[PDB]
Design a protein around this ligand. Structure first.
Ligand code: HEM
Ligand code: HEM
Ligand SMILES: *[C@@H]1O[C@H](CO)[C@@H](O[C@@H]2O[C@H](CO)[C@@H](O[C@@H]3O[C@H](CO)[C@@H](O)[C@H](O)[C@H]3NC(C)=O)[C@H](O)[C@H]2NC(C)=O)[C@H](O)[C@H]1NC(C)=O
Ligand SMILES: *[C@@H]1O[C@H](CO)[C@@H](O[C@@H]2O[C@H](CO)[C@@H](O[C@@H]3O[C@H](CO)[C@@H](O)[C@H](O)[C@H]3NC(C)=O)[C@H](O)[C@H]2NC(C)=O)[C@H](O)[C@H]1NC(C)=O
Ligand SMILES: CC(C)(C)c1cc2c(cc1Cl)C=C(C(=O)O)[C@@H](C(F)(F)F)O2
Ligand SMILES: CC(C)(C)c1cc2c(cc1Cl)C=C(C(=O)O)[C@@H](C(F)(F)F)O2
Ligand SMILES: CCCCCCCCO[C@@H]1O[C@H](CO)[C@@H](O)[C@H](O)[C@H]1O
Ligand SMILES: *[C@@H]1O[C@H](CO)[C@@H](O)[C@H](O)[C@H]1NC(C)=O
Ligand SMILES: *[C@@H]1O[C@H](CO)[C@@H](O)[C@H](O)[C@H]1NC(C)=O
Ligand SMILES: *[C@H]1O[C@H](CO)[C@@H](O)[C@H](O)[C@H]1NC(C)=O
Ligand SMILES: *[C@H]1O[C@H](CO)[C@@H](O)[C@H](O)[C@H]1NC(C)=O
Lengths: 552, 552
């Protein structure tokens, strides 16, 4: 009987109850007034008429290759354009943060406690008649049925943007430093207390773990040689807890920063490349500074690789996803005269939307073999057999699957995609349309509008009845794609504002950090400002193989 | 060894070592260039010709009362002047933070680890030949020697600005939520992980402790009634940990946020006052929101009390130090069109500079009683015998001591003063003049200029030999005060920027937090926006006694 269950307040205003059956919207700063904040101020009307849509802005950025080439080669214009991509999205995220799984009103508990993931929209209250609020049946549809009807794979669908296994395993590698759900406490809690890109997946969370993995000479990380080739050290040597099953022998239990990376050989491939990069950067700084000791050689090297990570994510990874002919840029200076809060907190909804399991193929194709999931998982024997070089050639070739578009989730991993739906409801996620309004988008008026077709749309109607009851995770994996694109509209417009805050809100982008002495001089600063996915591979893998986040 | 020991790089330039005996300065965004960042850019010269000194500004806000009398009453103007006091300060503090006691270069470990206090200037390196880097003798003067000669009180010196014991105990009480040193680890570490105004001294550091302190009905805090007067609850009842000497009987072991507050009866005064307040705010919030439950009551009250703390801090407490005829405002909307980061980290030098033990009188005077240190400390029966009303009346009347100007630390607490000296040296603090430069003040050119007299200057020159080797903390309590003022130049110009960062950087002062609905309605917002020390006492002390931070 909470009178805010129906989400009455609009355009980002806030609902407060003023009696057992009465509510009241606080419209402050929202550019609208009236009972439910639906009447615009004069200025706000003009702003709306002149502002374009996400789908129109997408057209321009993905057409006119000749105009964008002129723009891409004038340094001054390129910067101005990129500034606009950055600034036009900051307002979409709340920072300092606000809600979480247990708090639908701003509290000190919801602000102070770094073990929760924060939330873009608050959770439906426990005393609301229906799960979404006051719309829909008493219980949501069966998740197993949604899994089977519109998510699972029949015939493999490839990414028409030509993504590959270098890209998928890099997605999985990067993200698994900040997305680390503490399943003991629940779906809405986290073990990455750094909230953002601290490279804990190489160096460890605690100080205790960090020291076990360090050599204490020349700033380096422990390692071992097998087959005349540098690999991570063992568990028997170092004492770092890893999640292996007991039938793995001692000499194959590798130790790295992220306790879970032993369970896939693609994770452990990047694992070894990033480790090699650290020790390579140690050698560079050592020559520049023979006066430096072990700690400063280490602590500076970590700063450089946080620089490299962010650089590649913006100019190779997000560049590849985007589709754009415009060349994106990592250059923190664009924000020094703007209103940016250098800070971040991981949103539950960012974790949920990044479950891109439809990328994974039915088999894994290295050299002359086709490995199955049961053969691939837990099996580092494969790595040593083939070597880093063969892995890179082979995974640059193999094509990954389409995320949006529906019905392309691998059966090996059906359990996982079902968990995504169940844990959403358990965390009390508001509906798709309330989430699209939250990020300034037009609500879908039908299931056919969502999927751009008739078969899955017809299924989804029968199961949900009202389009305003449709859920976020499933909608993302079924949404109509952009032309020859990997993703739909909702994925990108929610995904991007979350991502940019965790990349640019890193303290090394802050004015007082972003200067050459921070990283050991000009020589260091240049590693960050010329890093790429192709050089990361070439510097650290025998014979310097060609690579890319797309098939050729 | 280290070729940056002599502190070459001026104007905030950062020193780096490019080999065993050769350095380099990073002048990025300083305004200067050249080997040591000393050659000014054109606009920098121009700005230094127009900027007035801090003493010029001080004189202007403390004269012209007929002109400030009009400004105050015309709200348009008032706001423009506050916005000047707020923004003129901001360039001084590093936010995100940078250094700490172990790291004199920037590092993930220094940024990431919330257990340290931060550092405004970096530590002096270990392998430097002297304590201040290169200047002075092998070792500093004997701290006993320093303490006895210029710091200890001979005869009591009253504060010319009329500061009383209400102000003494508000200072101690208020700041002991974020100055909470971890003496097992060492002086550069903290137990206060909110690095700010979270009010852990009323509610607790951990969710564990807070729950033990709460009533779980109407959002209230637990309490007991002794002779018709409401006091905090026992340790028996709560199970919360406090620090009492063995002889204290079960019924006088009170339970409060900060575990150390039982030791001093003046602290217990304010802890009982704010507890009565919290519960008072709950009763109001229930007449308004009879729908609400226990969590939402407790949590909105705790948000409201934070705002009252900040309100009273700026418009009574800091207003009283200032001596200004102009009336300060607490208004978060003044920073909504400025660049300002909404975060903070407490800094060692803030901790050190706020050891204002010269405030303490020779005895604590209540009704017709003059209690000694020995009698006053650890003895809460004194508070139960006289009662809140009479504690307030007595403390509104009793003048506290002058801090600056020398020779006013009372003997009882001399070991504290010495420790302040010795711990600074332990934490490798730099010189006084290195700190004055850092906050854009003029370095002192002699001990006589610093003190404004002859006798202490001669004894200090005899000990230190060179003005450039003088230490920060003893300097603060020796400094020539402003005309009839409690402090001098240095204390304020370092103090104010650190503090405004802790007041205004509070998450409750951002755009998304600062609006009626965060505080449960317009009623709740009114309780912050008309808060004062006078009303805090009036509503929570029997007979609404008159109070103030200065003797009539
Ligand atoms: C063979 C490779 C993979 C396997 C075996 C796998 C399987 C799993 C499993 C079992 C979970 C735990 C879910 C739960 O218990 O509820 C998980 C989490 C997750 N996966 Fe994968 N997945 C793989 C590849 C990927 C890829 C390519 C991505 C794309 C970036 C991805 C994204 C995620 C995300 C975001 C989570 C949640 C992380 C967290 O909250 O802790 N996964 N995966
Ligand atoms: C009148 C009774 C007081 C006594 C007996 C006293 C004595 C002491 C002692 C023994 C310590 C170190 C041990 C501890 O943490 O308990 C200390 C530290 C300190 N004192 Fe006091 N003091 C008194 C009042 C004040 C006042 C009026 C102020 C004014 C602001 C003040 C400011 C501080 C500060 C900021 C610290 C450092 C605390 C920390 O870092 O944890 N004290 N004092
Ligand atoms: C961030 O929020 C979390 C959720 O509130 C806190 O984690 C919770 O800490 C509680 C104790 O401080 C646990 O409460 C349980 O309480 C009973 C009653 O006293 C105890 O017997 C139980 O042992 C205790 N724990 C368990 C596991 O039963 C909560 O369980 C615990 N976690 C969860 C998921 O609820 C964090 O402490 C908080 N952060 C901070 C700094 O306080
Ligand atoms: C933030 O900073 C603090 C300083 O680095 C950390 O506190 C230190 O944690 C260490 C744990 O790794 C303690 O180590 C002691 O010393 C040896 C070193 O080899 C260990 O084996 C011992 O087990 C350990 N204990 C004893 C009794 O020797 C440090 O002593 C400890 N304290 C201090 C004052 O330095 C914090 O851990 C750190 N937090 C994080 C998250 O990084
Ligand atoms: C808007 C634009 C340029 C297309 C864009 C696309 C992005 C990202 C950022 C931007 Cl600005 C970051 C992404 C990530 O971090 O994975 C992904 C995202 F789908 F959002 F998840 O693609
Ligand atoms: C510049 C002006 C207005 C005089 C000023 C004075 C202050 C403070 C803030 C300002 Cl803006 C805060 C203070 C504190 O927190 O105790 C003290 C300080 F001495 F600085 F420590 O007095
Ligand atoms: C009450 C604390 C003083 C006892 C310790 C002896 C310190 C001696 O110090 C002397 O004190 C004289 C009298 O105040 C001053 O005139 C001298 O300048 C000073 O050197
Ligand atoms: C693991 O990989 C090895 C090496 O190719 C292979 O022979 C073996 O069958 C795999 N083991 C399992 C349990 O699948
Ligand atoms: C504390 O003061 C009271 C008077 O209020 C006195 O009776 C008592 O002796 C003192 N207590 C102790 C433990 O010294
Ligand atoms: C808000 O709009 C109007 C009042 O202007 C009212 O008819 C409507 O019922 C209000 N809110 C909802 C959720 O219907
Ligand atoms: C910096 O100042 C000048 C260079 O202009 C040089 O003579 C001097 O020795 C340098 N170092 C120091 C410590 O002043």
């Amino acid at each position: 009987a909470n009178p805010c269950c129906s989400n009455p307040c609009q355009n980002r205003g806030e609902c407060m109850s003023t009696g057992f059956d009465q509510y009241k919207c606080d419209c402050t700063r929202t550019g609208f007034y009236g009972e439910n904040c639906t009447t615009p101020e004069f200025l706000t009307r003009i702003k709306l008429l002149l502002k374009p849509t996400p789908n129109t802005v997408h057209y321009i950025l993905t057409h006119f290759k000749g105009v964008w080439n002129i723009v891409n080669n004038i340094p001054f214009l390129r910067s101005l354009i990129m500034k606009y991509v950055l600034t036009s999205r900051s307002y979409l995220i709340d920072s300092p943060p606000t809600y979480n799984v247990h708090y639908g009103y701003k509290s000190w508990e919801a602000f102070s406690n770094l073990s929760y993931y924060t939330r873009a929209l608050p959770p439906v209250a426990d005393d609301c008649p229906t799960p979404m609020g006051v719309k829909g049946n008493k219980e949501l549809p069966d998740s197993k049925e949604v899994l089977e009807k519109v998510l699972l794979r029949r015939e493999f669908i490839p990414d028409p943007q030509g993504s590959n296994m270098m890209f998928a395993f890099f997605a999985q590698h990067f993200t698994h430093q900040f997305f680390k759900t503490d399943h003991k406490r629940g779906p809405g809690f986290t073990r990455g207390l750094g909230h953002g890109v601290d490279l804990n997946h190489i160096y460890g969370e605690t100080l205790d773990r960090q020291h076990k993995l360090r050599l204490f000479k020349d700033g380096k990380l422990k390692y071992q040689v097998i087959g005349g080739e540098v690999y991570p050290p063992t568990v028997k040597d170092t004492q770092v807890e890893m999640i292996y099953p007991p039938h793995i022998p001692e000499n194959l239990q590798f130790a790295v920063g992220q306790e879970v990376f032993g369970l896939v050989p693609g994770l452990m491939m990047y694992a070894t490349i990033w480790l090699r990069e650290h020790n390579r950067v140690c050698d560079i700084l050592k020559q520049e500074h023979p006066e430096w000791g072990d700690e400063q050689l280490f602590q500076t090297s970590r700063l450089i690789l946080i620089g490299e990570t962010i650089k590649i994510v913006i100019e190779d990874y997000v560049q590849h996803l985007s589709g754009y002919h415009f060349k994106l840029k990592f250059d923190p200076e664009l924000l020094f005269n703007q209103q940016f809060q250098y800070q971040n907190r991981i949103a539950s909804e960012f974790n949920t939307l990044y479950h891109w399991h439809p990328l994974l193929p039915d088999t894994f194709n290295i050299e002359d073999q086709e490995y199955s999931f049961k053969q691939f998982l837990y099996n580092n024997s494969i790595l040593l057999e083939h070597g880093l070089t063969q892995f890179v050639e082979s995974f640059t070739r193999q094509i990954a699957g389409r995320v949006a578009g529906g019905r392309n989730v691998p059966i090996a991993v059906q359990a996982v995609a079902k968990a995504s739906i169940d844990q959403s409801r358990e965390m009390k996620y508001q509906s798709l349309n309330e989430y699209r309004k939250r990020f300034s988008l037009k609500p879908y008026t039908s299931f056919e509008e969502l999927t751009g077709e008739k078969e899955m749309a017809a299924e989804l109607k029968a199961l949900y009845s009202d389009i305003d009851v449709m859920e976020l995770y499933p909608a993302l994996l079924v949404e109509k794609p952009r032309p020859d694109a990997i993703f739909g509209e909702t994925m990108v417009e929610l995904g991007a504002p979350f991502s940019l805050k965790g990349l640019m809100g890193n303290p090394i982008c802050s004015p007082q950090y972003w200067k050459p002495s921070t990283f050991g001089g000009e020589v260091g600063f240049k590693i960050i400002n010329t890093a790429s996915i192709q050089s990361l591979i070439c510097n650290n893998v025998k014979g310097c193989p060609f690579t890319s986040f797309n098939v050729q």
